Design a binder for this molecule. Sequence first.
Ligand code: 58J
Ligand code: 58J
Ligand code: BR
Ligand code: BR
Ligand code: BR
Ligand code: BR
Ligand code: CL
Ligand code: CL
Ligand code: K
Ligand code: K
Ligand code: NI
Ligand code: NI
Lengths: 288, 288
Amino acid sequence: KSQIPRLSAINDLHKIWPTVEEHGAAIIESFLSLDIVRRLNEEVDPFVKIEPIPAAKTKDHPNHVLSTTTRLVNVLAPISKAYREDVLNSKVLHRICSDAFHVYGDYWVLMGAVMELAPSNPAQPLHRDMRFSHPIVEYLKPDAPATSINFLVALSPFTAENGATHVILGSHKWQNLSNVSMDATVRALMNPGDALLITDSTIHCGGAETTGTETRRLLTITMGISQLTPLESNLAVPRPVIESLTPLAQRLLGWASQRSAAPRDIGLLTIRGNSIEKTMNLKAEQPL
Amino acid sequence: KSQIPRLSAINDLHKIWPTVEEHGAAIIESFLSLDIVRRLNEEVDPFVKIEPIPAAKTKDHPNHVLSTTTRLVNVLAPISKAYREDVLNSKVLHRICSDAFHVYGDYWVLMGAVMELAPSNPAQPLHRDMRFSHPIVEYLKPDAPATSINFLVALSPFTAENGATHVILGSHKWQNLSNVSMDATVRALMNPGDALLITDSTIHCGGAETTGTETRRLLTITMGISQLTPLESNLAVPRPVIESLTPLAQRLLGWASQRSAAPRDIGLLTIRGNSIEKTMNLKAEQPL
Ligand SMILES: COc1ccc(/C=C2/C(=O)Nc3ccccc3C(=O)N2C)cc1
Ligand SMILES: COc1ccc(/C=C2/C(=O)Nc3ccccc3C(=O)N2C)cc1
Ligand SMILES: [Br-]
Ligand SMILES: [Br-]
Ligand SMILES: [Br-]
Ligand SMILES: [Br-]
Ligand SMILES: [Cl-]
Ligand SMILES: [Cl-]
Ligand SMILES: [K+]
Ligand SMILES: [K+]
Ligand code: NI
Ligand code: NI
């Protein structure tokens, strides 16, 4: 069976979205440099260690789906200079997103999360993303352009033995799911900084950790049209942090108004015909 | 031809959403009391008078669709005690919205706007709402439950002569629009405080103002699932104003996390498994 197409971040940029449109998945080699991976890992390290179980009794939005041994840290902008500067301004991410979402209009981060999978973490059931947050997506026409995509960035090696992601190629176009089986999957074997790009219709799962020794870490960036509500809020991020960002990064975090692709678009998150950023006199690129 | 069904806010509450599901429109008699209408009118009056043309050159999100003589004022919470207290906590509005949106989950305000139509304002072309802001809605399956509804509340008399709304009954179920004609419409004749309730698929239009003397005013409340991005932002509303509101009103303005109807919902606008309101220690019902 066909392996996941592998593309250059550097050379093949125009080919990435077309590849995912056709196959439902592509591996972007060196999506992030090892330097950015090192910085992001160092910055999020302590937040992963203090993070309670996904369904902790102290949480008012517990995640009952993730393995109890899994750790998920989102709202990364206040945690990680590497995330809010390098990742939110990624030339490769923005080319792919504008290619993917041009029919709809502006896009933003639905969730940027570091996930750490514990040794012996079981395989996730085969699934499509967004079904625990956005019931609306199941009501879209079968041939509706993808309204979200997910960059699964390796922050540690992804191997067959340590639970590298499974995908079913072509499954983003499936209506009948009677053929859904682990028999139909191929693996995203990845070095740190490689990214597996899938759509919200690609059938996939986290793999089984079978070594009982290896901790696997990823940065999952769900990018979606600005018409869909993010899984995460940046409302509590300090204004000085927001004002250190590029206007583009501010938009991705919901600290800007948003535009649809409608010819006479009237906009999203506006204030009497003016933008958030104009109304609030929101500064940009002010160092901390 | 059949007239728009008229229902009691007081007695018929369980019948309102079923009526709109069947017919695409219903008139809710005395949706708002005359006292609430009087207060809301007095509170928004000066903001309507200072409001520039919809496509003013000073605006970075101009509205090129509305008549140049029309005035639209949104983000009403900071302007209007009557809006943020009485209207956002309306028992009738919340029963209808929970009836309409239960398949999807939480709902919030996509836009609360006062519109003032000038004497001699022309009829709007027959349309469905949301097509200048949410291209996604056109990609929903034909039988997808409505993801937004619009309360068109009369703040002045709606008469045939002064441009009372037109609706095509049953048009929320239309796929083929070859029968779209003003010949197919009936009128929402309404007293101040009556509301015309339509869905995002009901074909309708503002009527022609033919007297050349009458100014018509309405409060349009587009309620939508929390999975869809509002047309307007409350991000610049002062925290003391937000903290004066009920927890429900805070949720409607996007100053709370949101839940989907998914059995193991993981939520919207959360912060590492906790709500906005828990994270920010957001107080409620603190008088100004
Ligand atoms: C154990 O099996 C699983 C675990 C997760 C999912 C899927 C999701 C989801 O749809 N969205 C995201 C997106 C990014 C990161 C996490 C999640 C997440 O938390 N869940 C629940 C399915 C199956
Ligand atoms: C002159 O003809 C028109 C004028 C308006 C619309 C429709 C919209 C719309 O879809 N959404 C809303 C919702 C509430 C209030 C205003 C609007 C609005 O601004 N427009 C543009 C159509 C036709
Ligand atoms: Br997991
Ligand atoms: Br994974
Ligand atoms: Br108009
Ligand atoms: Br109207
Ligand atoms: Cl616990
Ligand atoms: Cl002007
Ligand atoms: K699942
Ligand atoms: K129109
Ligand atoms: Ni997944
Ligand atoms: Ni309309």
